Amino acid sequence: MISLIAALAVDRVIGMENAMPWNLPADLAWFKRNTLNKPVIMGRHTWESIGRPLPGRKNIILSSQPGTDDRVTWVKSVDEAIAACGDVPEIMVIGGGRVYEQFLPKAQKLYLTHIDAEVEGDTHFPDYEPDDWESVFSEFHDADAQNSHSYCFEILERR
Ligand SMILES: NC(=O)c1ccc[n+]([C@@H]2O[C@H](COP(=O)([O-])OP(=O)(O)OC[C@H]3O[C@@H](n4cnc5c(N)ncnc54)[C@H](OP(=O)(O)O)[C@@H]3O)[C@@H](O)[C@H]2O)c1
Numbered sequence: 001m002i003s004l005i006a007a008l009a010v011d012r013v014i015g016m017e018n019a020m021p022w023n024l025p026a027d028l029a030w031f032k033r034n035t036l037n038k039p040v041i042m043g044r045h046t047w048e049s050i051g052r053p054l055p056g057r058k059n060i061i062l063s064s065q066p067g068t069d070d071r072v073t074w075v076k077s078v079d080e081a082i083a084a085c086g087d088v089p090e091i092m093v094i095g096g097g098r099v100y101e102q103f104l105p106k107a108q109k110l111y112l113t114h115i116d117a118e119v120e121g122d123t124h125f126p127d128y129e130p131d132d133w134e135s136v137f138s139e140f141h142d143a144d145a146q147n148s149h150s151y152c153f154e155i156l157e158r159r
């Protein structure tokens with residue numbers, strides 16, 4: 001199955017100028033625990049934002065052009081990306097906006113972080129029809145000495 005995982009600010013903002021302009025250690029820890037030991041699929045801009053491979057995960061980068069780093073696996077279409085993951089239980093799509101929009105129709109779960117932050121952005125999570133998803137997990141946290149905003153982890157499953 002295919003899952004998307006994302007962090008959303010107000011208005012579905014997910015990025016600005018190829019970065020995420022918040023800093024939430026709790027949410028990066030949640031990202032790691034939900035992705036480790038799985039394939040991750042990302043677009044080339046997100047690969048450039050992360051700036052290095054992610055350890056302990058098969059890294060599969062979508063680009064139309066040939067790859068430039070053999071520490072990761074480069075593919076040129078959605079179907080090739082899926083094929084390159086092999087027979088695993090859960091593929092994790094880790095963005096960015098253009099890649100999320102393509103994989104939404106093929107996905108069974110969304111792991112969302114809802115962050116209580118108002119920021120300007122240039123990238124959004126795709127609009128998703130709410131009726132088609134059920135919430136199966138919703139865990140709220142107030143801001144603390146490490147995490148400057150409140151946030152909510154949510155898992156949704158396609159009904
Ligand atoms: N908040 C979050 O959870 C989160 C998560 C991920 C990313 N982000 C943010 O999202 C932004 C990046 O997103 P983005 O929408 O600009 O870009 P993106 O989706 O990461 O990358 C798009 C690129 O991927 C390639 N691509 C996409 N679909 C393809 C396909 N079907 N076949 C072949 N290649 C394909 C293309 O590369 P080529 O141009 O090389 O052909 C395309 O330009 C950044 O601001 C980043 O910080 C936020």
Ligand SMILES: Nc1nc(=O)c2nc(CNc3ccc(C(=O)N[C@@H](CCC(=O)O)C(=O)O)cc3)cnc2[nH]1
Nearest residue numbers: 005006007027028029031032050054055094095113
């Ligand atoms: N929930 C969620 N939060 C995010 O921040 C996020 N970011 C991306 C894309 N960007 C990034 C940027 C950095 C790292 C990162 O450094 N993660 C490391 C270390 C985590 C840490 O230092 O705590 C990792 O091992 O996963 C991952 C993805 C995709 N999905 C997400 N999903």
Ligand SMILES: [Mn+2]
Nearest residue numbers: 116117149150
């Ligand atoms: Mn805030």
Ligand SMILES: [Mn+2]
Nearest residue numbers: 134135138154
């Ligand atoms: Mn909900």
